[PDB]
Amino acid sequence: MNAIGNFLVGTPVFTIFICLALGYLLGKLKIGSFTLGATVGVLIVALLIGQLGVFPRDTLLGDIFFDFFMFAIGYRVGPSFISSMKKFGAKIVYATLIFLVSAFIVAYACFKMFHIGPGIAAGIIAGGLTQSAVIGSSLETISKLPISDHLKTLYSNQIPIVYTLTYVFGTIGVLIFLRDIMPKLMHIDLKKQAVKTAKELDMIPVPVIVASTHFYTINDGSSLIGQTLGTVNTKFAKGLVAAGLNDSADMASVINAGDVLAISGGIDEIGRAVQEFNLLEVTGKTKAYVSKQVVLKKNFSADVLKNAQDKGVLVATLAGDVMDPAQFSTLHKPAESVTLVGQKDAVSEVQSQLGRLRAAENIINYSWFALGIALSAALGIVGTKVSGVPIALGGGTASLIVGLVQSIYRDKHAHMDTIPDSLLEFFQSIGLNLFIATVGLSAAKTFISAIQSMGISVLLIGAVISILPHIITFVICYYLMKMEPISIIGAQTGADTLSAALNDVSERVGSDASPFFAAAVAPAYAIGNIFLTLMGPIFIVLLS
Amino acid sequence: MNAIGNFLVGTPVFTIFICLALGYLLGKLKIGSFTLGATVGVLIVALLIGQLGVFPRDTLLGDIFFDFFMFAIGYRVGPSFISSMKKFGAKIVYATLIFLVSAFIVAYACFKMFHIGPGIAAGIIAGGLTQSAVIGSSLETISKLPISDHLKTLYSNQIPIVYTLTYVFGTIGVLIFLRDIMPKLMHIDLKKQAVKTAKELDMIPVPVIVASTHFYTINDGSSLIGQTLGTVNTKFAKGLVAAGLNDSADMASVINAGDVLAISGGIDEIGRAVQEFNLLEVTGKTKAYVSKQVVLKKNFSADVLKNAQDKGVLVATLAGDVMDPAQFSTLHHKPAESVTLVGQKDAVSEVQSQLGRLRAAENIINYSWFALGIALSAALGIVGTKVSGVPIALGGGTASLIVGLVQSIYRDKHAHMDTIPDSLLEFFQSIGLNLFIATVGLSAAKTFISAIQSMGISVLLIGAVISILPHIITFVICYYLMKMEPISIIGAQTGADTLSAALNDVSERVGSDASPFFAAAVAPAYAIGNIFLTLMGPIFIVLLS
Ligand SMILES: N[C@@H](CC(=O)O)C(=O)O
Ligand SMILES: N[C@@H](CC(=O)O)C(=O)O
């Protein structure tokens, strides 16, 4: 009855990580309410369970996990940002700026009209524009600005409760407004329109064949038996290479009654080469003929690539596609990693002539990741004072920038790693929920009193500030400027900085147009994050 | 100069995560010193950087990350534990018990002889026998036991420093002793001996072909043109199934001049089927013919599996191997087990609907399960009992390891939850322990120089002897008297001692072929060692108090 409170206060790990299971269950619960969402479910469960005791909030854990989340988001968005900036015009930047200006004006007007205190204003902003990074900067600015200590403590205490109150709407709505209402008003279907636009533009992924080795076995009949590999290779068209007899790299050899040929190349070419000059196919069993990806070191050597086919090694791109002869004339001063296949040690000989091996594709140099996080934390402290306002970049924004720059600084020097794609997902699906659960648990004891005292006056203001700017930008961009349909959704979801909408829309659209949607949304994210984070302290200073 | 201290104190994230990069760099550094190790490098860098200020230690972060590490280790070791218990005899348990008894006796004798205080004893145990979950239980027992408050605080303060002092040896040595010295003394080569033993036993992995679909194209000549698929399939031997013409499941059809056949099955069978009745090969381009893995729901239906081949869908195991006809008779009696279906786009779904629903996506993790596991482990930790006035509790890390083991074992028998990625446990168990160690080293750095000046050589040598001698004793007793197999000696004494760095290094050296065998040889000892070595701290505190 009452000892449960003591137990919960005494086992913080149990409390936090039981706030994370029921939350996900509730979020996945579907009762015709268009689901709820994992974050909202976690918040609700944390609020409900916080009533059984008093749990203080730990800053370091939340900061670390939020930093992980921001870094993962930045790394995921990195590669598409450059492509979108290259192809898409400045329309995305224009839409983001329009949205931010509209939100600023609307928030200022509403707060001035309703005579809202600076703390309530900051909380409503952070909980309506769904930007959790505000809280830290707002608290720092409150501490810095000179006012009475009672006011300082009151403002510091009043933020999280209104933040929690407004977040529920800021996430449950807006998502529906720009996922169903906007398509209904625009009389288009997400799938069809996105596919059409992607086909019109050059963004649809192009599947590529992967060249490999097939261990054929020679027939026991009579067809060019007892012959060297060099003449056979010369007879073969381009894109086919022999790989010895059993495991040997000797180029003279002697074909006997029974032995594998171990052809290498594409698929259609080997199909033709087996239809003509018939040969049997077998699974084969040998550890040789391993493939590798190797960077170059000898200043785009030409003759080595020219004679690799004679040597018995096939050269292909990183994706594993037979390269064109012209590619051998020049690559890209120095060159990049290429894929070699044939033989066991001949491939290594060609590699030694060329540069060293490439990233294993599944090993992560933890030094790089840890240094990135630490450098982001350090960069956060950098800041400047404008009109007595100590504005700083913050932590989450710095981590996002570091992720973007680090991702862009890859595949140009493919010598570090390829972080697994099954880790960023966990990071960006766990860190934010953990931070939200911590905040909700902390700001739960006084939630009922806060809602009783400050009631309807707050929720409606939060809803209007969350919704109206989206409608304004939608009308201005659709009826006046008349941009393409899907790009409107692509923006207004990065400027608003909400990831649930991003994930849901990507899943609905599908793989075909998923890269296109990612490109349409990437450029807005960084600008929105920076400006929306800076918009908190400015409001505090103005309304103080 | 001095503002750096203020900056470091004011940016804990920067401090901790700069203690994690230079540490890994140092660990990878090789100057002929047999490397150093990531954990030791992190500890050294943390000790060096802690001198510039005063940083208190946060318990919750360390507890969470250590729990993640323990859970990952348990999940990784789960599947092999049952297999080793099934095949390997109780020799592993006997060796672990011998090691634990020897370590207990040696530690007790040394401490009694040298008149060492309970706090120093607990710290030396923890920094020797490398179990790091001791500290929490030891602190809890110190708080519980009734003594003067000054003694309580002194004992609480004195643990981490000696722990850090002894951990360096406990990790750098022992590893070398049982990775190079023991093979040299036993006159065997790790690779050759492990391969020989694995070949003798039934543990070497067996590669399995993966059946799939090939989109052949019919020749424009004259060979059985204009024929139905049913007669073609009946003519074809077992293991080959047609998949329509372009995307259709109609079984009457009409073969025209140009259209793909879309055969499905193994590789050798299709090779034979293309040498006889020659057909061209093309890459093809279609989204149909997708493969799926589906659990069963209709109580091991027989006729459906019998007629699936006629329907045009090939049934295979989870690994993707054509099943034997006899397998269709019984299967496995309850409605369970998932099988792989390949042919066609919607016919596969029809067969699935006749059978049970789909299986785990193999790349999506129900975070609810993981979070509930962690929370349940934390709760289970609190459970404990008092023996002779000693409140012994299972602790947190041990509970997490047990939960990981049980959860892993409770999978593939009900393959309806997930298959956690294998690129996440590695990160967990390579980051959590190092983060915890960095935090502890940063906290216990200000007074390290004074502690070494006051309590000096008397501690390091005792730690080294307690870390080394039990291994030698068990080695001799098991090799010269009992005469067990060579590699199993290394397999034990590294789980009872709980030395994950040695585990990983030996696995890498041995290679993939005998890696499962080594994992089996080491798994059963880990749990017993963890539990008993964790309980051995409070007992020592009570005895020597
Ligand atoms: N930046 C966060 C916003 C928040 O969680 O407050 C997001 O994208 O979801
Ligand atoms: N159980 C841990 C002990 C430690 O190193 O802290 C291990 O095997 O590594």
Q: What is the DSSP string of A236-257?
A: S-TTEE---SSS---SS----S
Q: Which residues contact B161 (CB under 8 A, 6 or more apart)?
A: B123, B444, B447, B448, B451
The number of residues making up chain A comes to 544
Q: How many CA atoms lie within 13 A of B312 on its CB side?
A: 28
Q: Which residues contact B235 (CB under 8 A, 6 or more apart)?
A: none
**For residue A170, how far is its CA from the centre of ligand 1 (angstroms)?**
11
Number of the ligand closest to the Cα of A131 = 1
Find the closest chain B residue to A368 by CA distance. B21
The backbone region for B353, taken as left when phi is positive above 0, alpha when psi lies in -120 to 50, beta otherwise, is alpha
Nearest-angstrom CA–CA distance, B539 and B141: 9
Pocket probe for ligand 1: among A172, A434, A499, the residue whose CB has the most ligand atoms within 8 Å is A499
Nearest Cα to Cα of residue A217 among A241, A239, A246? A246
From the CB of residue A291, how many other CB atoms can be counted at a distance below 10 Å?
17
Nearest-angstrom CA–CA distance, B191 and B514: 8
Assess whether the C-beta atom of B500 lies below 6 angstroms from ligand 2. yes
Number of the ligand closest to the Cα of B530 = 2
Number of the ligand closest to the Cα of A69 = 1
Nearest-angstrom CA–CA distance, A285 and A431: 46
CB B531 within 8 A of CB B512: no
Nearest to B363 among A64, A209, A422 (CB): A422
A-B contacts at Cβ under 8 angstroms: 138
Q: Encoding tokens for residue A402?
A: 């570091």
Nearest-angstrom CA–CA distance, B21 and A370: 6
Element (H, E) at A338: strand A338-340
CB A191 within 8 A of CB A154: no
CB contact under 8 A, B60 and A364: no
Indicate the SS3 state at residue A37. Answer: coil
> Side chain identity at A435, as an amino acid letter?
F
Indicate the SS3 state at residue A7. Answer: helix
Gyration radius of chain B's alpha carbons:
30
Q: Encoding tokens for residue A105?
A: 């004006």
Element (H, E) at B508: helix B500-510
Q: Which residues contact B156 (CB under 8 A, 6 or more apart)?
A: B119, B139, B142, B143
Residue with tokens 């993981």: B370
B252-284 exposure pattern, b = at least 16 Cβ within 10 A, e = fewer: ebebeeeebbbbbbbbebbbbbbeeeebbbeeb
Nearest-angstrom CA–CA distance, A251 and B453: 70
Judge whether A378 is closer than 8 Å to chain B, CB to CB: yes
Q: Which atom of ligand 2 lies at the shortest distance from residue B397's CA? A: 1
Nearest to A60 among B61, B267, B268 (CB): B61
From the CB of residue A382, how many other CB atoms can be counted at a distance below 10 Å?
9
Nearest-angstrom CA–CA distance, A313 and A293: 13
**For residue B110, how far is its CA from the centre of ligand 1 (angstroms)?**
57
Nearest-angstrom CA–CA distance, B422 and B434: 20
Assess whether the C-beta atom of B164 lies below 6 angstroms from ligand 2. no
DSSP letter string over B195-217? HHHHHHTT-S-------EEE-EE
DSSP label at residue B358: B
Nearest-angstrom CA–CA distance, B421 and B285: 30
From the CB of residue A539, how many other CB atoms can be counted at a distance below 10 Å?
23
Listed in sequence order, the DSSP H helices in B385-514 are 397-409, 425-443, 448-454, 457-476, 486-491, 500-510
Contacts of A17 in chain B (CB under 8 A): 371-372, 374-375, 378
Nearest-angstrom CA–CA distance, A281 and A468: 67
Cα–Cα distance list, A92 to A266, A401, A467, A498, A503 (Å): 41, 19, 20, 16, 19
Contacts of B278 in chain A (CB under 8 A): 275, 278
Q: Whose CA is nearest to atom 3 of ligand 1?
A: A131
Number of the ligand closest to the Cα of B66 = 2
CB A347 within 8 A of CB A290: yes
Q: Rounded to 5 degrees, what are φ and ψ at A316?
A: -140, 170
Listed in sequence order, the DSSP H helices in B88-206 are 91-114, 118-128, 134-144, 149-176, 182-186, 190-200
Mutate to test the interface with A, among B7, B9, B14, B39 (most CBs of A within 10 A): B14
CB contact under 8 A, B271 and A278: no
DSSP letter string over A290-322? --EEE---SSS-SHHHHHHHHHT--EE-TT--B
Cα–Cα distance list, A164 to A20, A436, A474, B232 (Å): 16, 9, 27, 67
CB B103 within 8 A of CB B470: yes
Assess whether the C-beta atom of A40 lies below 6 angstroms from ligand 1. no
Q: Which residues contact B86 (CB under 8 A, 6 or more apart)?
A: none
Residue with tokens 């993966």: B210
Q: Whose CA is nearest to atom 9 of ligand 2?
A: B500
A491-529 exposure pattern, b = at least 16 Cβ within 10 A, e = fewer: bbbbbbbbbbbbebbbeebeeebbbbbbbbbbbbbbbbb
Nearest-angstrom CA–CA distance, B490 and A482: 73
Nearest-angstrom CA–CA distance, A168 and A172: 6
Contacts of B430 in chain A (CB under 8 A): 366
Give ∠ CA A164-A169-A173 in degrees, rounded to 5: 150
Sheet arrangement for strand B292-295: B292-295, B338-341, B315-316
The resolution in angstroms reads 3.4
A194-220 exposure pattern, b = at least 16 Cβ within 10 A, e = fewer: bbebbeeeebeeeeebebbbbbbbbee
Find the closest chain A residue to B277 by CA distance. A275
**For residue A129, how far is its CA from the centre of ligand 1 (angstroms)?**
9
CB B538 within 8 A of CB B141: yes
Q: List residues bridging with A322 in a β-sheet.
A: A316
**For residue B527, how far is its CA from the centre of ligand 2 (angstroms)?**
12
Indicate the SS3 state at residue B278. Answer: coil
Nearest-angstrom CA–CA distance, B536 and B526: 15
Element (H, E) at A436: helix A424-442
Nearest CA to CA, how far is B272 from chain A (Å)? 7
Find the closest chain A residue to B23 by CA distance. A367
**Termini Cα distance of chain B:** 44
Assess whether the C-beta atom of B541 lies below 6 angstroms from ligand 2. no
Q: Encoding tokens for residue B369?
A: 């399960």
Nearest Cα to Cα of residue A134 among A121, A147, A146? A121
Nearest-angstrom CA–CA distance, A41 and A26: 5
Nearest-angstrom CA–CA distance, A244 and A232: 11
Assess whether the C-beta atom of A493 lies below 6 angstroms from ligand 1. no
Nearest Cα to Cα of residue A169 among A487, A521, A507, A498? A498
Q: Encoding tokens for residue B441?
A: 């080293």
Contacts of A371 in chain B (CB under 8 A): 17-18, 21
CB B132 within 8 A of CB B436: yes
Sheet arrangement for strand B212-214: B212-214, B263-265, B240-241
From the CB of residue B90, how many other CB atoms can be counted at a distance below 10 Å?
10
CB A121 within 8 A of CB A455: no
Nearest-angstrom CA–CA distance, B305 and A270: 35
Q: Whose CA is nearest to atom 5 of ligand 1?
A: A132
Judge whether A364 is closer than 8 Å to chain B, CB to CB: yes
**For residue B136, how far is its CA from the centre of ligand 2 (angstroms)?**
14
From the CB of residue A447, how many other CB atoms can be counted at a distance below 10 Å?
17
**For residue B209, how far is its CA from the centre of ligand 2 (angstroms)?**
39
Assess whether the C-beta atom of A433 lies below 6 angstroms from ligand 1. no
Cα–Cα distance list, A441 to A320, A437, B68, B73 (Å): 51, 6, 22, 30
Q: Which atom of ligand 1 lies at the shortest distance from residue A39's CA? A: 5
Nearest CA to CA, how far is B421 from chain A (Å)? 7
CB B354 within 8 A of CB B307: no
The number of residues making up chain B comes to 545
Nearest-angstrom CA–CA distance, B233 and A167: 61
Q: How many CA atoms lie within 13 A of B308 on its CB side?
A: 30
Nearest-angstrom CA–CA distance, A372 and A74: 12
Nearest-angstrom CA–CA distance, A83 and A202: 11
Nearest Cα to Cα of residue A75 among A484, A385, A524, A410? A410
Indicate the SS3 state at residue A324. Answer: coil
CB B521 within 8 A of CB B198: no
Q: Which residues contact B440 (CB under 8 A, 6 or more apart)?
A: B46, B57, B62, B135, B160, B163, B164
Q: Which atom of ligand 2 lies at the shortest distance from residue B132's CA? A: 6
Nearest-angstrom CA–CA distance, A453 and A530: 33
Nearest to B421 among A24, A371, A422 (CB): A422
Nearest-angstrom CA–CA distance, B360 and B348: 17
Nearest-angstrom CA–CA distance, A290 and B316: 28
Indicate the SS3 state at residue A540. Answer: helix
CB contact under 8 A, A20 and B274: no
**Termini Cα distance of chain A:** 44
CB A39 within 8 A of CB A500: yes
CB A243 within 8 A of CB A264: yes
CB A320 within 8 A of CB A293: no
Element (H, E) at B56: none
Pocket probe for ligand 2: among B499, B503, B506, B533, the residue whose CB has the most ligand atoms within 8 Å is B499
Judge whether A48 is closer than 8 Å to chain B, CB to CB: no
Question: Hey, which residues 54-83 in chain A have their CB within 8 Å of chain B?
Answer: 58, 60-61, 63-64, 67
A500-508: long-range pairs with CB below 8 Å, 24+: A500/A37, A500/A39, A500/A171, A500/A175, A501/A174, A501/A175, A501/A178, A501/A179, A504/A175, A504/A179, A505/A179, A505/A190, A508/A179, A508/A190, A508/A191
Element (H, E) at B255: none
Nearest-angstrom CA–CA distance, B534 and A128: 49
Nearest-angstrom CA–CA distance, B377 and A80: 41
- In whole angstroms, what separates CA A82 from the centre of its chain? 14
Nearest-angstrom CA–CA distance, A317 and A308: 14
Gyration radius of chain A's alpha carbons:
30
Indicate the SS3 state at residue B5. Answer: helix
